Ligand binder design. Structure first.
Ligand code: NAD
Ligand code: NAD
Lengths: 291, 291
């Protein structure tokens, strides 16, 4: 049982950068990876900005401290464009790149040849079976899902996904790692949607359908779930918040592998909006318009 | 323009007593109806204790005002075992009794002939279509759903259901009444589950099925939805809170009405717990053990 000290995060987007940020802020030695240096420098700048925002709202009584915090955490975030150059000495690889099974497998297959014997491989994906990706390597015992939620620095939850091949040693390691990041880990098999998404998304789709049916208004559905269920965000504010494109993606997928399941029939409204580039808060408009 | 001032509540259970308490606590004259004097004496005793509980905090700095509040509210709640005798000149009849369609229709067909012409009829039912009960009277235009949530005096939401026969005058009357109770009304057509239950129960069942499939434990699933979706209670904690038998009854109804919808497929575990009289908190045990 080895303790994860060096993390190699692959993906400089919202998730990857967040994962990198939290790992470094909790003492882990990180190497963020992306295709260009501009992508990387820009991703790291976002980390700094986010971290400084944290600093002020924690070290407001001694900026001198907040500065050390931010530079210390930032310094342990090395960067590289070819992950193959650092996996030979890394303890864990957390992938958070484009949802393309082929590209992911090509990545992990090559990474398999460079990685150390102990090195563990994890994917933060939400629309692919960890198993499909793990079979690109001959490291299945050290392969598993490590699912975070945006905004990673804030969401306390982390789903540790166990394939039929994940060893018990790999599992305890990521569980331990999850606690080391200050997050709370849960267990789930390699089933579509895992826990959260499997229970959130189908619900988000139902709300949409109740609206399309004209049974009630969006504003009302949102009020109904917030007040009658105590949810932080109404379903339509949540859809716009997590992305309409992101949502449609996971659902088209589920629908694809089970065309007959009613829980995944596509929504004309969600499609139209998505075809119109109205992805929610990201694009300033989804089911609602924004500032 | 009908302004609801005199309200007749039929049913002194958890929902009934709660609806009467709030109505009376917000300046409306109330007549609570039930089958026997003891029932009534107990319902009114609970209302009095709930109010005291509040008044002992709310008026800590004003004991006198606190008593006046409790007495005035209490004395604005009359009791009776003869509904027909009360609705002679009432403005609103809110029904919250045993979930038997046959019994509700009889009660309403009868009340319909004694109530004043302007009296609006409403049902707080969760497992019946308002249209059905409405057609037991010849006052359908004055018949609607007025759905509250336990604990009534706390939950600020109220679903105002309008059938395709309900008048706008009626709808608006109940919307103003809702605000008068200090609640926040939302509109939904007469469709099974309306909004909250229609979007919450099937989710709760999906949580149960995920567990029945063995994909994840109840504990992790609840932790997952709380930390990952910010929900106040995990689906299992919530299931024990709302009543496994209550939950079950609704789902069955939907299953009977739609025997082929997979969202209403019975849950072996849910049926077992009910069969073993483990309904949740109101038993000390359901999916979990309490106190
Ligand atoms: N958006 C969410 O809240 C959320 C939650 C869970 C999971 N996910 C999934 O996690 C992934 C992370 O998404 P994101 O929002 O950060 O997106 P993003 O587009 O901002 O970041 C992805 C990054 O992957 C890089 N990349 C692509 N191919 C690469 C390769 N071969 N080598 C190195 N880098 C490569 C891209 O240049 C890009 O910067 C997505 O696939 C997404 O579906 C998203
Ligand atoms: N229990 C819940 O959490 C919950 C949540 C939502 C909706 N509901 C619905 O709300 C209504 C209220 O349920 P409750 O929890 O207070 O139940 P309850 O069984 O505690 O109360 C019902 C009351 O109705 C009385 N009653 C029955 N038939 C009657 C009749 N013909 N005339 C007069 N009184 C009669 C009973 O004596 C009893 O006091 C029901 O229709 C129920 O399906 C229940």
């Amino acid at each position: 049982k080895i303790i994860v000290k060096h993390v190699t995060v692959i993906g400089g987007g919202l998730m990857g950068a967040g994962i990198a940020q939290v790992a470094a802020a909790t003492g882990h030695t990180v190497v963020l990876v992306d295709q260009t240096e501009d992508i990387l420098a820009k991703s790291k700048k976002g980390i700094e900005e986010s971290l400084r925002k944290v600093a002020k709202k924690k070290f407001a009584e001694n900026p001198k401290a907040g500065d050390e915090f931010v530079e210390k955490t930032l310094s342990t975030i090395a960067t590289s464009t070819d992950a193959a150059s650092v996996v030979h000495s890394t303890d864990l690889v957390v992938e958070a790149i484009v949802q393309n099974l082929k590209v992911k497998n090509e990545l992990f297959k090559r990474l398999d040849k460079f990685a150390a014997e102990h090195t563990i491989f994890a994917s933060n994906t939400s629309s692919l079976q960890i198993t499909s990706i793990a079979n690109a390597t001959t490291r299945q015992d050290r392969f598993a899902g490590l699912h975070f939620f945006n905004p990673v620095p804030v969401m306390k939850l982390v789903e540790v996904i166990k394939t039929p091949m994940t060893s018990q040693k790999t599992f305890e390691s990521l569980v331990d790692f999850s606690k080391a990041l200050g997050k709370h880990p849960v267990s789930c098999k390699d089933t579509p949607g895992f826990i959260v998404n499997r229970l959130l998304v189908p619900y988000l789709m139902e709300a949409i359908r109740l609206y399309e049916r004209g049974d009630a208004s969006k504003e009302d559905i949102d009020t109904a779930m917030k007040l009658g269920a105590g949810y932080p965000m109404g379903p339509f504010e949540l859809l716009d918040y997590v992305g309409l494109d992101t949502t449609k993606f996971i659902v088209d997928g589920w629908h694809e592998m089970d065309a007959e399941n009613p829980l995944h029939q596509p929504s004309p409204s969600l499609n139209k909006l998505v075809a119109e580039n109205k992805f929610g808060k990201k694009t300033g408009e989804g089911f609602y318009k924004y500032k």
